[PDB]
Amino acid sequence: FSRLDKVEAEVQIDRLITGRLQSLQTYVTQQLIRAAEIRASANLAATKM
Amino acid sequence: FSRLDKVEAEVQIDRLITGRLQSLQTYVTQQLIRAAEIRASANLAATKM
Amino acid sequence: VYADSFVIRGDEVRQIAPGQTGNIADYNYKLPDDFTGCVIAWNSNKLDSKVSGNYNYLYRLFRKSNLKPFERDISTEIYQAGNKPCNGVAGFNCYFPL
Amino acid sequence: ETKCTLKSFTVEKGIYQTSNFRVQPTESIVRFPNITNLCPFDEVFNATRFASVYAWNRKRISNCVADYSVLYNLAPFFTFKCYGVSPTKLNDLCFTNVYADSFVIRGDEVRQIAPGQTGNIADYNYKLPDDFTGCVIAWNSNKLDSKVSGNYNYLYRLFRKSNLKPFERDISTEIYQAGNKPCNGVAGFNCYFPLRSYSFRPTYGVGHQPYRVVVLSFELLHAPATVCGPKKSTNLVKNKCVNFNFNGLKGTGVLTESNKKFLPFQQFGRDIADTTDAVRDPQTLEILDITPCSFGGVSVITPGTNTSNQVAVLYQGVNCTEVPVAIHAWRVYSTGSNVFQTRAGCLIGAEYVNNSYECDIPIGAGICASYQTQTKV
Amino acid sequence: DCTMYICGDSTECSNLLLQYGSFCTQLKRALTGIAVEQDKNTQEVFAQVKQIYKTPPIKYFGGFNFSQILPDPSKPSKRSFIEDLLFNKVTLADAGFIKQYGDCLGDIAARDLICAQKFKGLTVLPPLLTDEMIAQYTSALLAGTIT
Amino acid sequence: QCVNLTTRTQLPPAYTNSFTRGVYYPDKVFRSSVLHSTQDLFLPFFSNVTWFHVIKRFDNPVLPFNDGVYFASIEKSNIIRGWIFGTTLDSKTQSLLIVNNATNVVIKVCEFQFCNDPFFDHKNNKSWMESEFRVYSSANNCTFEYVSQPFLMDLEGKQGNFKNLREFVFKNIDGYFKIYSKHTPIIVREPEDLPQGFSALEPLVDLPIGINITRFQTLLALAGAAAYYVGYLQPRTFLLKYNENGTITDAVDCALDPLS
Amino acid sequence: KIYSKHTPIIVREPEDLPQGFSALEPLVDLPIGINITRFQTLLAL
Ligand SMILES: *[C@@H]1O[C@H](CO)[C@@H](O[C@@H]2O[C@H](CO)[C@@H](O[C@H]3O[C@H](CO)[C@@H](O)[C@H](O)[C@@H]3O)[C@H](O)[C@H]2NC(C)=O)[C@H](O)[C@H]1NC(C)=O
Ligand SMILES: *[C@@H]1O[C@H](CO)[C@@H](O[C@@H]2O[C@H](CO)[C@@H](O[C@H]3O[C@H](CO)[C@@H](O)[C@H](O)[C@@H]3O)[C@H](O)[C@H]2NC(C)=O)[C@H](O)[C@H]1NC(C)=O
Ligand SMILES: *[C@@H]1O[C@H](CO)[C@@H](O[C@@H]2O[C@H](CO)[C@@H](O[C@H]3O[C@H](CO)[C@@H](O)[C@H](O)[C@@H]3O)[C@H](O)[C@H]2NC(C)=O)[C@H](O)[C@H]1NC(C)=O
Ligand SMILES: *[C@@H]1O[C@H](CO)[C@@H](O[C@@H]2O[C@H](CO)[C@@H](O)[C@H](O)[C@H]2NC(C)=O)[C@H](O)[C@H]1NC(C)=O
Ligand SMILES: *[C@@H]1O[C@H](CO)[C@@H](O[C@@H]2O[C@H](CO)[C@@H](O)[C@H](O)[C@H]2NC(C)=O)[C@H](O)[C@H]1NC(C)=O
Ligand SMILES: *[C@@H]1O[C@H](CO)[C@@H](O[C@@H]2O[C@H](CO)[C@@H](O)[C@H](O)[C@H]2NC(C)=O)[C@H](O)[C@H]1NC(C)=O
Ligand SMILES: *[C@@H]1O[C@H](CO)[C@@H](O[C@@H]2O[C@H](CO)[C@@H](O)[C@H](O)[C@H]2NC(C)=O)[C@H](O)[C@H]1NC(C)=O
Ligand SMILES: *[C@@H]1O[C@H](CO)[C@@H](O)[C@H](O)[C@H]1NC(C)=O
Ligand SMILES: *[C@@H]1O[C@H](CO)[C@@H](O)[C@H](O)[C@H]1NC(C)=O
Ligand SMILES: *[C@@H]1O[C@H](CO)[C@@H](O)[C@H](O)[C@H]1NC(C)=O
Ligand SMILES: *[C@@H]1O[C@H](CO)[C@@H](O)[C@H](O)[C@H]1NC(C)=O
Ligand SMILES: *[C@@H]1O[C@H](CO)[C@@H](O)[C@H](O)[C@H]1NC(C)=O
Ligand SMILES: *[C@@H]1O[C@H](CO)[C@@H](O)[C@H](O)[C@H]1NC(C)=O
């Protein structure tokens, strides 16, 4: 916003929205695959309890 | 397409092609993760049967 | 479809694009960031110049603030670039704006 | 807010996370090092004597802060003029180089100074280039330099074989020829000394009395800048949320005194997260922490909308003494009296009780909430 | 807070993010689905007994010495000697507890990663069952089997 | 004044291993109790720095300045006066002088027709005090200029023959010239050269010179017993530890060996 | 930009604005091009 107009800026910012939104979606996806593993372990822990 | 010309319209379409294809990749990842959790339940249901 | 018309110094046609800045862009005529439309400009010296000087075409030199897109200001009030209040037609750095 | 976030009018029993609480900046604050050395206007404009328009002087403004407005607001009224730039932009701008050209003329060749011009003073001694950026500053020196004898030592060149180049100043005192026959020696028929004095005396009229003149001819913006304009600053607040700038580092936050010590050359400090969380004050040197203005996830506790509209709010990870500082000047839960500190955050709108039931809505950290007939009308 | 993560402190960036919209909600729901599951896991593992059993005051069991795995009254949390050993071994990041701005402003904020992550919109939440409540269920299971 | 003396003693220049030195604070920023990676120009660890040394021996050769340079001297009595940096050092194009006499500093970007062999006679001030100027014969365009109070402050109280070590990093980048430096009191070795152990260099001054630079030279007093070392920066990833006070306390040259 | 609605109503006495819901329809958009910071109403006697 400091060095660019509205029409160049909303293109440069589209990269910063995209790349951060990819980074968050990656984190949520790996968290879901980790949650499925921790769950498999909790179901084994309840079976052993 | 009722508003731009092929040599500059295609940049607007290319963002949408990306964003829509990204949303399908999100859905198919989320379905593969839920489907692994339903399987984990089907193999449990098969063990109780 | 609202058709806008005026005249300007030809060097400043650059300023009529959306999101621009400069004298006419900030102090009398601005298109919005979200502007949809088309600009057409043409030299008209053959129909608008006169060798005596056609001083009946004019622009704004000063203003309190940068105007909103498609605002239009026909005020003839004196611009006080001087610090002190500047009653009436003139004073130290008090400007007739047109 | 839950109905808006879930995009349904009917919210089932539960705890729902919503838009994050964030206190807003009270004002804006700006800080810049209280202006360093200023540029040499007292030499350019407040000289004892100016050069003649044939003799026109050249001077460099460099390694300093420009201050165009105070030079105009000094005690004399002087007649500033322009040709081709926004005059009010310049205080807010930087320059690759700032060059001043200085001379004296009468009140009628004042127009011949501009680029594109022609006539004796445009043609033989003082030409600006036909892409010139800048403005022309003059005053009637008739109060100071004008002498009732004639002050004649201010001359002008009035002939040149050719029109001289932009910023070529010609000092060659060569005899000029208007006849086709050659002018040998110092004089002849249509042979001329190419300069003449101005007869300035306090009686000479408008257009003919003496004027001291300066042109500013700067090169700008494209290559590393030797002079800039004056950079404005406010007072230095603390412990209140604000929009801030320090030296062109732009953020928003709460300024606070830090006991952390920078080394002499460090200006900003960044956290483990690789973004700014401290700065040094540039006018007065002290180390200030920046904290992003206070916030915390807002989760709303509700029974089924099919049963009541009474709700409670958890401010996640917030101590209950902080959230009332977010006074709005929605906010009815600020009035308090029913407030409780959980380990999960501050809870408001529900009453804490010793009747330990089974869980119903899970708040966290061993706390549950329920909608119940509180009667241990 | 997807908005404070993506867009640091900007209403204008918050306007741009609104053209993407439902992505942010889909991520927030997906992380909420995980956060709910952690409590279900802990309930399914420990909350198997609907009653909280106690051992009698006279600890004798045929010569078997459960005193190293039973609760000790002298500790404020009712954990066993072996539980209070295990709790030293794992160096937890953010065990849910409050940060009160006496601490996450000033000294500790100069070097604490948790106080850093908080400012970037990333948040850890407490489990529904505290480690004193998991000690109570774990005692109830242990007191049940030894008697 | 300028006279190129015949008394030159040509010899094969020595080399020394650069142990762990030549790390400077890469940016204008505070950080503490953290490990920060950077990609920037640094002196590679354990490189052959070139070694130069005077006695009645004398050696003021011109050296390349390709990509940027580390200089350091182990000294007494301020025998280094400063440096000359440029591309021709003969007014055919610009050059930069940075030097310090008995009384002040000067830093000047003027065309300076350099002498065939620059120096300044003092001989421990045994028989005279500052009067010579064997550096240039002419001075054409002095575009940039800067003077200030005299630099290079000694160690306080002294100790017998006890030298001081002065480290400098010099770089030209995006039109700006960057000086970083460090002074240390050092217990003198006798056969050995360049002390093992670590400390970082702070940014001294930043200057908008903009010239082409290709080579540089070291200005020295005229017996003395000074010695110094010169090394080149290279582009290399580096890992810097910052302590809780916020000083660069240790560093790893990322490409040194497979462990690093 | 002007948006508006008509609604015929029974006259409840002590209170104000009949509690209930309608939207307004868009009436006109006008290129007036001018600052408004103050407004006034026009009445009959
Ligand atoms: C069950 O096993 C227990 C662990 O071996 C055992 O407790 C231990 O008993 C000894 C002897 O009483 C203690 O030894 C210490 O006794 C006091 C403690 O203040 C000190 O003054 C002595 O110097 C000595 O160090 C152990 O400390 C104690 N261990 C623990 C963890 O309490 C029980 O006695 C066993 N149960 C039965 C029925 O014998
Ligand atoms: C050796 O020490 C000298 C000071 O002890 C120092 O002299 C200073 O040099 C500057 C730049 O050459 C002079 O600058 C002024 O010179 C005249 C004054 O009339 C003007 O033309 C200039 O605009 C400028 O004002 C200083 O006058 C002079 N300092 C003093 C106190 O007179 C030498 O430069 C030092 N030499 C080296 C190699 O370091
Ligand atoms: C981080 O920065 C601090 C300032 O450079 C530095 O603190 C200083 O450390 C010394 C050595 O501990 C202290 O010396 C005094 O210590 C006690 C008083 O606590 C006296 O009994 C001693 O006789 C001695 O005078 C300094 O007082 C102390 N200065 C301050 C302002 O606290 C730290 O040591 C630095 N950290 C590291 C790792 O070096
Ligand atoms: C900004 O200006 C003020 C004064 O105009 C300077 O602050 C002074 O600093 C000296 C030395 O520390 C103190 O003795 C004075 O009491 C201070 N005066 C005031 C008004 O506080 C300050 O140095 C200037 N800024 C810079 C960067 O030098
Ligand atoms: C909530 O914030 C308050 C204010 O910081 C805390 O109250 C302080 O607690 C300490 C330790 O008990 C006392 O030494 C202080 O005297 C208290 N100050 C005040 C003004 O009450 C309180 O402990 C915090 N609670 C939590 C859970 O964070
Ligand atoms: C120092 O000696 C060098 C080398 O002999 C001189 O350089 C030559 O000088 C002669 C005479 O002026 C010129 O004709 C040559 O073209 C020079 N050649 C080179 C490669 O420089 C230098 O002039 C001497 N300078 C002084 C001050 O004695
Ligand atoms: C800096 O000095 C050099 C050398 O004196 C100048 O180069 C000469 O400049 C004159 C005057 O413009 C020209 O007539 C010559 O043809 C130039 N010769 C060469 C070899 O360049 C240069 O103009 C000066 N520049 C500045 C900015 O002062
Ligand atoms: C001009 O300089 C003199 C000192 O040489 C000073 O007395 C006078 O006030 C200055 N005038 C202005 C307008 O600055
Ligand atoms: C909502 O509550 C009412 C009674 O107050 C009940 O009649 C109705 O069936 C409930 N609606 C639903 C969707 O359960
Ligand atoms: C809970 O019981 C204790 C006494 O054991 C009493 O002090 C406290 O005020 C009670 N709290 C409420 C909210 O009734
Ligand atoms: C360092 O210099 C010596 C010659 O003095 C040479 O044998 C050695 O291989 C050199 N090593 C490097 C890495 O330059
Ligand atoms: C020196 O710089 C000029 C312009 O700055 C450039 O044209 C020239 O190629 C450069 N030459 C060298 C050797 O760096
Ligand atoms: C409207 O007038 C007010 C009062 O002077 C002024 O503050 C405001 O900036 C003006 N806005 C526009 C768009 O003209």
Structure summary:
The structure is cut from a larger assembly and holds seven copies of chain A. Chain A is mainly alpha-helical and 49 residues long.
Description:
- This is part of a larger assembly, with seven copies of chain A.
- With 49 residues, the first copy, chain A, is mostly helical.
- Chain A has one helix and no strands.
- The first copy, chain A, has one helix at residues 6-48.
- Chain A is rod-shaped and about 65 Å long.
- Chains in contact: A-B, A-C, A-E, B-E, C-D, C-G, D-E, D-F.
- The interface between D and E is large, with 38 and 37 residues.
- Strand 18 of chain D pairs parallel with strand 2 of chain F.
- A molecule of 2 linked components (NAG-NAG) is lined by residues 140-141 of chain F.
- A molecule of 2 linked components (NAG-NAG) is lined by residues 33-34, 283-284 of chain D.
- Chain G: It comes from Severe acute respiratory syndrome coronavirus 2 (2019-nCoV).
- Chain G: This is Spike protein S1.
- Chain G: Glycans are attached at residue 35.
